[model samples]
Target: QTRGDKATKILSGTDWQGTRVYDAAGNDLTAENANFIGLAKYDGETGFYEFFDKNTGETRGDEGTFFVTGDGTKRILISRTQNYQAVVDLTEVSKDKFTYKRLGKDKLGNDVEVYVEHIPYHGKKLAFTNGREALTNQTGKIVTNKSGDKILGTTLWNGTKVVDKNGNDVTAANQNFISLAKFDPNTSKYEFFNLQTGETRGDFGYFQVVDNNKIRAHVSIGTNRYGAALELTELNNDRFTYTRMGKDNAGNDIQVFVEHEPYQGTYHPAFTF
Candidate 1:
């Protein structure tokens, strides 16, 4: 196996014994190389590899692999046995910010639906559709703060609305709170807001829209005082950035973020006008 300039080649013991070598331009200089049972050609646009069966000299349909790094580096194999699907679909929602959806299958043989909603200050949000009730429901929210503290946000749902920090009705009846942030369209400033209390909790000092879809907001939340400054930054689309801010327990800056998963290609009926 060979890779490009910035690419690192991983020759597994299994790979070493069964893999063959090829140049970047696909010149088959070596014939019938030993050890490798398959060959993969990386497609930069799709971020997946096309696999060729070394033994049968045939293109292995949907047998490939890719890599994903979170806190550490990891490699994921993409194949029919694993799941005949794309690892991730990266849609540019904004500059330096992209919507990532994972494709997979569920235990019931239904398609596993994966969508990510990102609200600045809030991290990745996951949701699913409930077929029985014909409603959309949320699972959780992931937050990466300035201190590298990863916080998880959860929703306590009532039949009609969602509960907030103050235990008040933050969302409308039959509607749920997605995510909240402080955004000033006129001034182009982005901050954090608590939708429940309608409070501005943090200041994301400065930001500029880099592109039609990209805006970066500088933010900070309180620690205990109304002035406990903690910087937060967000780069995202128009819809995700423009909300109010809220304060956390330490009186520090806490930015609210949310992502929504609508059912059956329709908006949440309760939230949609």
Candidate 2:
């Protein structure tokens, strides 16, 4: 007789006495007078095993197994100790399917989350430090707005030279070492001159906002050694632009240089009359 998918028979002939024989595809299988037979079937999709007792005609035991496959065509066993646990064998999965995230600790004990946009040129990580309250670049440089307390104005460099709107060097003691100065809110022009040499390094010209953010000052310097009518354009911040309009000893045309951003540390530290 056959039990489900397996054939089992008890030979009762005179030559074979009290013997049970099982045939699987014409292959003779011998059982030593066993009273029970166990059958185990594996379901690959569900990773579950089912067992049945042929003699008792009842279900026995069932369990699940985890496995992993490697690139070298090798099978490896994985541990499935915890309930609802999965074994993530890297060899069995595609490499392209893997992803990574940033990890760090914030000011609090909570986990910090980071999203990287693009890799910097220097391959450095830029982050925001909560202690400093500043957004620092990879080079540890802090970014700030310069339009507020930081005022951009010109200052007298050479304290001994006094010059007028024209190229002529003036001998006025009070006209030496003047700077191109101006305020933002109004058009009131000012001069920062050196009291010792009377050299007008900075002169009061026209002050106007060249662009939406920058303030430009058109300053006139006396003739240099070449007697060229030198008109220097000083911008707020630390930018300096200049041009020569020809040797006109009495010209009053204001030379307006192109407006641009200012330098950071070129302004005067202290202001006095």
Candidate 3:
């Protein structure tokens, strides 16, 4: 294969997380940097790339497309987006590590200051941490049962408290947590929505009812958080309680007592795919 083909194969279907960033003076700015925390994902078969935060499940602004140029052993990565552009050599990029640096010369052979304004980024491939599960055999497909009908609809569930095995209350630490769950029987998918804004929080997975009292869900919260089970403790007309065992998206233990009351009025989700 040619150098361009090899470079494209290296970048496509890849993911990287910035480990450190350096400015023109070689000062490390990764400690206080906000934009580089987002993970970079390259498209599998296209030139598109996306920058998104794995922890918060939010997409950052630096997303665009990139193409390769140059001959064998002299590959150059040329990235273009609405915000800015980058021309860097692909010598330091590999399956395990990725480095981005600005070119020292412009297109017209004029001397340009490297890293004067644009920062250089060094990132490593991300591995699963905090006991996060993989998609392995956990298909996000749900086969509805009679028990699933109770929770299979658009409803608002107020997340009150998250307790550990000792039954210690940690609600104060997670005041901003909300769970507006939607179990779509038609699609066999369970989705998490924001109650206040009526926006989908990007937490979804296939679900199935194991019994009349309990149900299991194969959850995927974002690009990072995936594969967990849902256990129903109580179900009734007014309120219900469920428990999720294992590490959450933030790597916290999940044994929460979320009380959900059916919405008084009809809820129309604000965002649609």
Candidate 4:
């Protein structure tokens, strides 16, 4: 219902949780309107954002999901709701502003699709635009799913580094006194080298998109599995930050910041991105 030219940042949940959408004015969007609403979870296999009705208080039955296509700059969102697929264009106006507009319908049959933006609600409010209340006190949920296709075995993990709390070095290769990364396909993963064991490979890891413009890694060390679940924001196409979080398990707060150098291979990735 809003005419704002852009959407606020979508929560790139690390725990596979949901994030409420916000409008340009930062208002919370609700299901009370004629617009059919369903919260979503990531479905990597189908390349769609899928989930159930956020229609609230009285539960709804409408299922919704959407897929994305197009180039680095011009992208389209294709959605399946009820019985129709709605195609919408997503245009980035500024780095923070993007326009979402529907072009027309596709396939057979008919069903009108509606997607509006809203700000996430704080505890100060009990209900959204509707009087309907949700359990866990959330108005709706969102999933910023990682893309399904992974980098080829050895081509996956590009680089690595670990140093003091002050490794914000943007261009120095010497930032991390102990910099190492190794990949092995037989194990189906890659990880940092043994800084202590004088070994070459230690962790088996891979990267995936956390949200719109971020990346994270999932790796295994010995018998324990660890999550590199913080945002890796882009500085440019060639330069990026793969955040390193926490002293108390780190990055439990703030942007776990770092300047990482990952080797590039041809990737059809939002993350290999």
Candidate 5:
């Protein structure tokens, strides 16, 4: 087929994440932690290629175009990205699945082959929508609460403010971002819902409690498999507070404070995804 034919249609306008990997001998070596652990997106409309590495939390891919050649079992893919042309043998491809192989030579000049399988996400855009705010000053302290993380896993929260490492309030910039979030205690699934429409903005993932004041968040996005580590600063039935520790561009300490309150409106929707 051609670039605008069935083969291309199966690969275009899709987002895929690595599902498993194997060697030439049909051995399932996914536990070897292959380097293909990330997300890939093909913009068929614009012929743009996008990739995000979950291992290193980086967005480094060849910003180039892609096209398909050949047909049926002999299908070939020419992906030009990162200033390089990659000629791939498409072993299997469908609406929700993709499989490809690469050939290499071992140190002994032996033929080495690798196979990878990628699965598609139902949603096209998978953005990491954890509570993000740029805080300039750093001066906030961890406040104690009688009711701690117990209220976090089962309540709908509305973020109120954020503070920097200097404990200065800095919630004006991204106040509307991640304004509402909820976590399911049983399944550990979480979602960030839109405030006005009550629809999901494609930000849903899994969460895990680490310790008394720590929890891990793994969103359903390509660039953030490790997710964010949040430290509970304050927690109560009426309010919940957490801190995301990080550093600024100047190598100075920075923080994102998420001050949330119990959602009191009627537009909240049931978690579906």
Candidate 6:
């Protein structure tokens, strides 16, 4: 039942972005016009992350294992990572940067003071790590809100994202997605509120209770997080499953299995899909 608890939810969402390799001297190791695409999950059962990479595609698929750490402050990366070579101290220098010393010399008998920074769980560019990676954001998801008037990531609302009277992207905030969720016996499914238009049907695949004592869609309620009900060996009148697909005009390739979380008293983390 705590299956969702065993996931390494990327504070926001895990959109794969390749990193630029660097040496102690701060020289770049990655070539121009390219970066790798990779994604990973913490084996909550093991201290290691079951990592993967793709020579191509936004969703890189493959595998390897490495130790992952942080407390909500230190951002770390270890590869060419060996037996028990850890940092005695990993200190942050700035929001976007930090300095650290390894626990022991490497095979080269070399001690390296490496630098670290935030990996963008959704960012301010130079934003630093919040410390832990489990605090996933429900911002873009079809989430619960104080007022059920907004629609998370839907074009009807976020399409043009034109500025309103207040001069903000109409769809800039998930607040725009605020709306009520209701069960409709007519269709034997759940229907979500869309302030801009009318109610639309959402396919509920699963339902879940958070580490906290609240209930939410086993998936989420993101307008952008919709697709087909690909798997169903089981069913529930309150459970409908979905995979959010399609790209925004900005060319963000989305094919995530977004869970539809209706009202949960407040927005909070439930699981990672």
Estimated TM-score for each candidate: 0.24, 0.19, 0.37, 0.30, 0.43, 0.22
lDDT comparison, 1 vs 2, better candidate: 1
Quote the lDDT for 239 in model 4.
Answer: 33
Ranking by TM-score: 5, 3, 4, 1, 6, 2
Clashing pairs in 5: 62-82, 137-166, 138-165, 138-166, 138-167, 139-165, 139-166, 139-167, 140-167
Q: lDDT scores for all predictions?
A: 0.28, 0.26, 0.47, 0.32, 0.54, 0.28
lDDT of 5 at 217: 30
Model 1 C-alpha lDDT per residue in residues 24-126, reported as the tens digit of each score = 3343323332222344344322223445454554455544333332221222333423343222333323322223444323334344443332212211221
Deviation in Å, model 6, residue 151 alpha carbon: 35
Tens-digit per-residue lDDT, 1-273, candidate 3 = 435445556665466555655555565554444344556666423334666564654455445444443232322212223334433444455666655554344334454433322222244444322211221221122333333544544364555455444556655545544566666533335667776677778776444333333434343434445443455555554555555454333658675544456655455654243
Candidate 5 Cα errors over 4 Å, as ranges: 1-150, 165-167, 221-226, 245-253
Q: What is the lDDT for 185 in model 2?
A: 21
By the lDDT metric, which is better: model 3 or model 5?
Answer: 5
Q: Worst 10-residue stretch by lDDT in candidate 4? A: 131-140
Give the better candidate number (2 or 4) by lDDT.
4
- RMSD for each of the candidates: 20.2, 36.7, 15.7, 16.3, 17.1, 18.4
Report the lDDT tens digits of candidate 2 across residue range 1-273. Answer: 012001101100001111222222222223321322333333222222333444442444422232122122211111122222221212111211111123323334344432211111111221211111121112111112332112333333322333334434442433322233333222222334434444344343222222122212222222221111122344233443333222222444332222223322344422232
**Number of the top lDDT candidate:** 5
The local distance difference test score of model 5 is 0.54
Quote the lDDT for 14 in model 2. 9
